[PDB]
């Protein structure tokens, strides 16, 4: 399909399958959920009745005592020692098929174009590594929360946006569904656009 520009007014040709396909609600949600789960690290643990410091001696005899039968000071129904099902460090990452990941990414890109949240422009660069310059460049464009995607990563643009929370700078290869969804506006360079079709295929 045809992607219009706002600065050079130059036509761009892009496959409609990767930019004009329908929006799959179910597929995108699964990929987004999978991405969040993969961000976890699951560094937690408790002590079961075997790992609690203590001794296995019976608190009192089985019979004769007037109170409930007890077996150990570390039973889960006892104060200061227990946890019936203690947690262990676990991996929460889940598998997502390559095609499913690509399909969700294609679905997300198409809808950004439909909601005009995606803006394609020519090369986006800053002459000097100054956050002030980048802020001015984004101010006249009426953009405050933007994700800058460029074909080639340059330290000059990387340093300029480092201290800008609402602004992110990324490469085409390092593109994730969550970032595209989260950011209000996405700006893609002409080079950045081309690499997307090649990797998306």
């Amino acid at each position: 399909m045809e992607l219009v520009l706002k600065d050079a007014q130059s036509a761009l040709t892009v496959s409609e399958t990767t930019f004009g396909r329908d929006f799959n609600e179910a597929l995108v949600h699964q990929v987004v959920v999978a991405y969040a789960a993969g961000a976890r690290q699951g560094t937690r643990a408790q002590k079961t009745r075997a790992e609690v410091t203590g001794s296995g001696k019976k608190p009192w005899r089985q019979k004769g005592t007037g109170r409930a039968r007890s077996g150990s000071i570390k039973s889960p129904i006892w104060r200061s020692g227990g946890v019936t099902f203690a947690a262990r460090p676990q991996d929460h990452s889940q598998k997502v098929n390559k095609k499913m990941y690509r399909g969700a990414l294609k679905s997300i890109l198409s809808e950004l174009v439909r909601q005009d949240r995606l803006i394609v422009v020519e090369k986006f660069s800053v002459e000097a590594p100054k956050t002030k310059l980048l802020a001015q460049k984004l101010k006249d464009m009426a953009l405050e929360d933007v994700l800058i995607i460029t074909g080639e990563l340059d330290e000059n643009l990387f340093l300029a946006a480092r201290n800008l929370h609402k602004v992110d700078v990324r490469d085409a290869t390092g593109i994730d569904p969550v970032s595209l969804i989260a950011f209000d506006k996405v700006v893609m360079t002409a080079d950045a656009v081309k690499q997307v079709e090649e990797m998306l295929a």
Binding site: E25, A26, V28, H29, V32, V178, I181
Partner: protein, 143 residues
């Protein structure tokens, strides 16, 4: 929009939680009934147990034997016969197509249909209809 995505209806069920109140349905033993071996924690009978009666897999006699030659043989379809490499098919170069496996050293061709390109097979065996199918296509058989 990150707070607007939802899953498809019926994708989630929320699972079953046992022993959480009366109105929840399966509380008070959570659907495992009253006393008994099956109601105990960790209880149950191993696979094939019949309560003491001779199990079915013990009442019946063992039969047959395992043939080692069967693990080194495979069957070749007509559909995948023509997508190996050009128009020549042999015991070798099928592993390159990855349709038999490295360890396989015997192969047969059976009638699976959908064969168009004429192909030549050497060192393989075409049962009855594979010979007819390729000959119509324009192939040949030689050992």
């Amino acid at each position: 929009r990150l707070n607007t995505l939802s899953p498809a209806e019926g994708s989630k069920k929320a699972g079953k939680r046992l022993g959480r109140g009366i109105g929840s349905g399966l509380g008070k033993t959570g659907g495992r009934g009253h006393k008994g071996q099956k109601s105990r924690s960790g209880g149950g009978v191993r696979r094939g147990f019949e309560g003491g009666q001779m199990p079915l897999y013990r009442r019946l006699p063992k039969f047959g034997f395992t043939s080692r030659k069967a693990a080194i043989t495979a069957e070749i379809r007509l559909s995948d016969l023509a997508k190996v490499e050009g128009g020549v098919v042999d015991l070798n170069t099928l592993k390159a197509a990855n349709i038999i496996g490295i360890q396989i050293e015997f192969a047969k061709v059976i009638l699976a249909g959908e064969v168009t390109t004429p192909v030549t097979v050497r060192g393989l065996r075409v049962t009855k209809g594979a010979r007819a199918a390729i000959e119509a296509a324009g192939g040949k058989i030689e050992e």
